[PDB]
């Protein structure tokens, strides 16, 4: 089945590009005049006065929430006494169809399974040893070659001729002994 067709009705195609009319047709920049919406603009976004110009963190509209007894309003649990016991019924979230749209049917089955752990401690320890010491062996296999080739570059040789090379911007000067 096509699950999109189930909630097609909720999705009415839009009319305005970016979901707003031209400011001339309706001024969404102004604060809403509706009672209880003085902190919102006409289009529903928070007004600059509420968030910037008169932000409460800056000392505007000072109103301490806590009361004299050091208390704030707290909503209680859904308590249901039964069978000589006081129970609390937890709040279950609404069906995912309401929030997301797809109808919650024909859900694929993913069973409960405890974590996929590697076992056999002895075997695992040996692998971890190899994870460290196999590279170490390779490095040791390169070490001797590295020493030899370094020694080879820095070998005192019986050179019989010298060519002096100076690098300047932007050319190479060469000084060579002239035949006598």
């Amino acid at each position: 089945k096509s699950y999109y067709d189930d909630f097609k009705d909720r999705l009415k195609p839009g009319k305005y590009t970016q979901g707003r009319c031209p400011q001339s047709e309706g001024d969404y920049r102004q604060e809403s005049k509706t009672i209880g919406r003085e902190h919102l603009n006409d289009d529903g976004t928070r007004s600059k006065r509420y968030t910037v110009k008169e932000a409460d963190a800056l000392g505007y509209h000072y109103h301490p929430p806590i009361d004299k007894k050091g208390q704030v309003y707290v909503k209680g649990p859904n308590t249901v006494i039964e069978r000589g016991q006081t129970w609390i019924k937890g709040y279950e979230l609404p069906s995912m169809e309401y929030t997301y749209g797809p109808k919650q049917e024909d859900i694929p089955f993913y069973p409960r399974v405890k974590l996929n752990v590697w076992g056999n401690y002895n075997l695992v320890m040996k692998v971890e040893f190899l994870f460290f010491y196999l590279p170490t062996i390779i490095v040791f296999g390169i070490c001797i070659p590295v020493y030899t080739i370094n020694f080879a570059q820095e070998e005192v040789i019986y050179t019989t001729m010298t060519v002096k090379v100076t690098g300047r911007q932007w050319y190479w000067v060469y000084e060579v002994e002239s035949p006598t």
């Binding site: 970016q18 707003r20 902190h39 919102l40 289009d43 529903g44 976004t45 928070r46």
Partner: protein, 65 residues
């Protein structure tokens, strides 16, 4: 307040003004121009052309164009 629960609530709730996105893209576009415009200006300053013609610093055949 419920409106203040989420950081950048208007954007996260998909109500933000599109101009914010346009400015971000424009800012990136201007940043890119800082590599192209001085290239053209410097080329003209030292040569008299905004951009070279491929291989115009080398010998070209008579019919090359």
């Amino acid at each position: 307040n419920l409106e203040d629960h989420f950081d950048l609530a208007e954007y996260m709730m998909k109500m933000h003004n599109p101009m914010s996105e346009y400015l971000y893209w424009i800012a990136g576009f201007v940043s890119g121009l800082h590599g192209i415009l001085p290239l053209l200006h410097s080329n003209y300053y030292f040569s008299g052309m905004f951009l070279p013609r491929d291989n115009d610093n080398t010998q070209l055949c008579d019919d090359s164009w």
